[PDB]
Symmetry: D2
Subunit: 116 residues, 4 copies
């Protein structure tokens, strides 16, 4: 699995479950093309977005639908979404974990990048 | 001043100076139109981006050019930029400060919304 | 003013007001001796804790009473407090700002060290 | 496993390996008593600190030796350590993950708390 996402909730001290995530890849014509999407599991994790073959070099955007998450919990949050934009596989194939820690008016994100 | 940005460096423990910041407002066709930009000051702050009259309700995006900042420091970054996207609302407090704390492979952002 | 503290609330998007803050300096016997304290202001800031003459090199601890803050808001917190422990050094910049961004089950802290 | 720690490095985008961690429990006499210690693995994780039987209610301090970590990487960091202090098992037994994301002049921490 070369691209996985993990989302945590800093209010409840839990995984952030059922969070929608959309991944896009920047095209030759400089638009964002749909790449993959899914929702986080009970563990806050989203696996199985892509494959090593399909996940070629490029600029990727991971959009995490944080606003829907908070509204379902009764909270009107600040952000529309959290977006993580990065170049992938520029130094050969890597495995990427995109982590995000959510609060109503804040988020933090980090990457864990490993060499297969 | 209804919209301020503050950028800090978690590696050096300092303001993040000379970081380019672009603000966009979402148009009716759902594209992003340029709205304001500047470079952070010696204190990591960017003031004067807009005015109360111009900063009407809507969806805005603040894009912070983190990659160029790290590159200037000789350090390999992960992200192309940090994007903060939010709705401006007239119901709440009048002043938005968008703060970002930068590391090469990570950033944290918060909003401080006051009167 | 060589030591400032700023505390922000990641739930409300605001300064964290009326948060108790205690500073301690590590003694030769390795116990913590009280040094300064106060409550954050309406802007989430606490100034005037010490002076340049008093703030000599050594190990200091800044304890932020996060639990009482959340309790006052009716929200169950995880931590008893947030502790920031560091060495003050004369070689570097003169002004330390300890910033903390608070959530019920999480906090982030950074140092901004300037002239 | 009722108490585990995970440490990540926000400079390198990797686990924080070989990080020393000391856990203390507040005694009846209000001192900090040693409870358990270990080091993070290649995955940035520390498991096996304690057992469900031993991990009774109390106030616990997890001290993560961040300064040694950064100095080994050639960096002179701000903090002496990162300390996470919390009451455990007050609403019955729980499993706790203490996560920390490290930078030279900053850290973030969160808890993931689950009911067995
Ligand atoms: O004036 C200030 C403002 I506004 C914000 C910060 C701040 N400290 C942070 C620590 C972690 C994450 C984030 Cl976003 C943070 O923002 C500090 C100062 I000084
Ligand atoms: O398995 C994981 C666990 I548990 C925690 C995180 C985590 N990502 C963070 C980003 C910012 C701040 C903090 Cl404390 C974070 O904690 C990541 C993974 I992968």
């Amino acid at each position: 699995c070369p691209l996985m996402v993990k989302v945590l909730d800093a209010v409840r001290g839990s995984p952030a479950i059922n969070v929608a995530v959309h991944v896009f890849r920047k095209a030759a014509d400089d638009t964002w093309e749909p790449f993959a999407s899914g929702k986080t599991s009970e563990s806050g994790e989203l696996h199985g977005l892509t494959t090593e073959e399909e996940f070629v070099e490029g600029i990727y955007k991971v959009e995490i639908d944080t606003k829907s998450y908070w509204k379902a919990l009764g909270i009107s949050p600040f952000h529309e979404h959290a977006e993580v934009v990065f170049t992938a596989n520029d130094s050969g194939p890597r495995r990427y974990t995109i982590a995000a820690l959510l609060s109503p008016y804040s988020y933090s994100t980090t990457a864990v990048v490993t060499n297969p």
